[model samples]
Target chain A: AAMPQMISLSEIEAVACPCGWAQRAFGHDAGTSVSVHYTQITKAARTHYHREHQEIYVVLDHAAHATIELNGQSYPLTKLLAISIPPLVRHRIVGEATIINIVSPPFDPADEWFDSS
Target chain B: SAAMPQMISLSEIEAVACPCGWAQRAFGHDAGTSVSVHYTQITKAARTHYHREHQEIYVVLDHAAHATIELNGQSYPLTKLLAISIPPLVRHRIVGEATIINIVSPPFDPADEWF
Candidate 1:
């Protein structure tokens, strides 16, 4: 397994996620399975879907009318914007941001799927 | 088919030329290797690369008080939400002014960039 490691996302501690307050670092064991979340959207977010998890979202800091609805189309979440949600699709994140959620096969809270909330 | 939600604009993407000085890549553009995102810009004259198959993750967005990272020769302390998980050949760089958020997997390949 490859080495070179150093993680401390501000000491990691930010739970409650669905696009709100995450801080995950590595995943499945942290040796590399692709997992990095530093989210903080803070407000609107609740239309989720992820059957196997294949996300990218990286929009570190935003406020110029942040937006990201996907599957229904919304786009425009300023600042280093980046979105690449595959798998099921159907996403959400509409205001206030500080994102970075890159997961590919590592980040499974039952695959996080919420039909209405 | 499936695979839609795509919108990459790392500040309007067009920074290229990266050995650590400038980058603005996102999702490698097809071939479906999965995962690829970079927005690096850490230069104090960085150029000690290595990757034969990719596997990186160096998030350190700002608060850089003279950042530093070297790996495979040891040298750390790249603060501000620091995250560094470089695997696959080791030998890394990153030395002064910082601005990172590079996460790669099977994607991001400029011929595996090994220098």
Candidate 2:
């Protein structure tokens, strides 16, 4: 009763974002409940939060380079870290790292809001 | 407007026995309700199957395994970070030994899986 969807990550091209270069996979802003984005970062990513999306960030290699600040609290993330962030939690990708982000309800550019902090 | 963030180490997740090897449900419907993640330890016995609705992405974390994937009248070697993309109905399956972070969009449901 469902449809078919399969592809390779190698084929999905990575793109640019305020944080860094990212490649969005899965259903992008349409009618799906999730989207995966591969990101390569090296800068102070924009600290922001989502209104309805809860993201699960998986840092590869179990080793991370930069610090992931979530809601005024900094977590030491090295190597690969799997963390699920609830909606409206102010967060940012500060420093250098390559990570994969799984966003529920998919990622909509319209839902992005820069944190005042 | 946000709840306490949830975090976990890979070593902390439990392993599950499967037909191929083992899998650990990380961020799934049971874990939550939105998405699903499986830290799978796949053996060289993964069956060739496809999905009817579930779209998946496999981030090969450890051990590069040789896998042969079948598609519409063709076959392609599983290459670097093979993730399922959309607009492309990739009805395929693999057989190899590899450790990967399997992410399922919309939370992997048994109802969406097919052979």
Candidate 3:
């Protein structure tokens, strides 16, 4: 017999990221296969670029600017938009923002590989 | 080879019935078995007690009274309610009426055994 895995939305705890304030991940667990993070970024700051897994970001509410550097080119966010970031592609988000980010095969800190150069 | 049946809605011709004023039948066609008649009725009237092959009545909108519902004995004024009437059972409606009644397995004039 197989048991069902049930989780309530209100029960999951949230934690802030080490690199930024006001931005957070909703929950962390190895068994978690799918989840969405509601983040509110309040500063225009540069990030230490690194990548480990694939993730997609959708702008659900509010609007702001995003400057994405892919293969040495920049893209600007003008309105409500969504973008997919594939695995191993070094990318970083910059500018004031509020968005919902979804990751499949969830985000594992253990798998995050930083640039050593 | 299986083919998809054509979907039809409005844009089809409309018809009126006698003895009942302000009532209409939306469409009638059999593209080989399976047909439906979407109707709209307005006013207070009683149907001359009758029945047909396997029928179900679901109230999509409005408030009215339903009397003599086939399986459920005893009649009452069902406001904004739905009732199902199966085959071979005589039923009728009366007083303070406003409703949209749909008869399925398609109400055929050729096979209508009026009683």
Candidate 4:
């Protein structure tokens, strides 16, 4: 039987990501099918795509005045806004912001890809 | 062809009445049944509720002092950045001040909510 898993993001160590820094949760847990990440970006992040992962980016900082460049188009990343990025879509965040990223099928580092050009 | 990127703003979304208090839900319209996210304001006297088909993960974004959440009759301290994944059929509710980010799978169906 699957049970509830309680975790504090504060307890998770912050690791370097393409975005900046991230505290990820439930990436290896068997009880859940998705992984959540608390990411903080201070500058432009690397553009990347996933072959099998779909992600939902929820803006946590309304005052950051951030924008996310998706597949060559920039869109406002305002507070209370959640953007769903499908697989094969290239994306990166511009400006400093706090975001909560939810990835389905969990997040596999092996699935992350970057454009060579 | 892959699906295009979609965006929804909770601020632009109207708050609707819920058992906990009120919520601004996004991705409920066309994000498919895979996932949806909600911004919910939980009252001190929130009602205990459960879902039969949806599993929810609650992340407390903001809260006042001495906040806590109860799951299946067990209490745990709740604070900013605390999260809990509630599987289907698990009764849950929050006590005290809280502005939460709720991520639900299979989307959020009003019919699935049970007291």
Candidate maximizing lDDT: 4
What digit string (tens of lDDT, one per residue) describes model 4 on residues B1-115?
2378888888788899887778999888466636889999987486788989888999999887888899999999987899899999999888887999999987778889788
Model 2, runs deviating above 4 Å: A1-11, A29-32, A61-65, B48-55, B61-65, B71-74, B85-92, B105-115
What C-alpha RMSD separates each model from the true structure? 15.6, 3.7, 18.4, 1.8
- True-structure Cα RMSD, model 2: 3.7
Model 4 residue pairs with clashes:
none
Winner on DockQ between 3 and 4 is 4
Per-residue accuracy of model 1 over A1-117 as CA lDDT, tens digit each: 677778788689889865578989888887687888887887776788898888887787888877888777887777787878888888888888888788887887888777764
> Sort by TM-score, best first: what order?
4, 2, 3, 1
How big is the positional error of residue B49 in model 3, measured in Å on the Cα after superposition?
38
* Candidate 1 chain B weakest lDDT stretch, 10 residues: B26-35
Residue-wise C-alpha lDDT for candidate 1, range B76-115, written one tens digit per residue:
7778878998998998887778888788888887888787
Candidate 3 — which pairs collide?
none
TM-score of each prediction: 0.32, 0.79, 0.38, 0.93
Residue A2's lDDT in candidate 2: 34
**If ranked by DockQ, best first, what sequence of candidates would result?**
4, 2, 1, 3
Please state the CAPRI-style docking class of candidate 4: medium
Which lDDT tens digits does candidate 2 get at residues A1-117?
133344555567777788878877765634445777777775666788988888988877323446788888888776557888888888987777777888887787788888464
DockQ of each: 0.33, 0.46, 0.02, 0.73
Which residue runs of candidate 1 sit more than 4 Å off their true CA positions? A4-30, A36-46, A49-67, A70-74, A77-80, A83-101, B1-9, B12-19, B23-38, B41-55, B58-89, B93-101, B104-115
Which candidate number would show the highest TM-score if scored against the true structure? 4
Candidate closer to the true structure by TM-score (higher is better), 1 or 3: 3
Please, what are the lDDT tens digits per residue for candidate 3 over residues B1-115?
Answer: 1121122222133546533334444324433222233444545354554445433232323444353222223354444323232333444433444554343343334354444
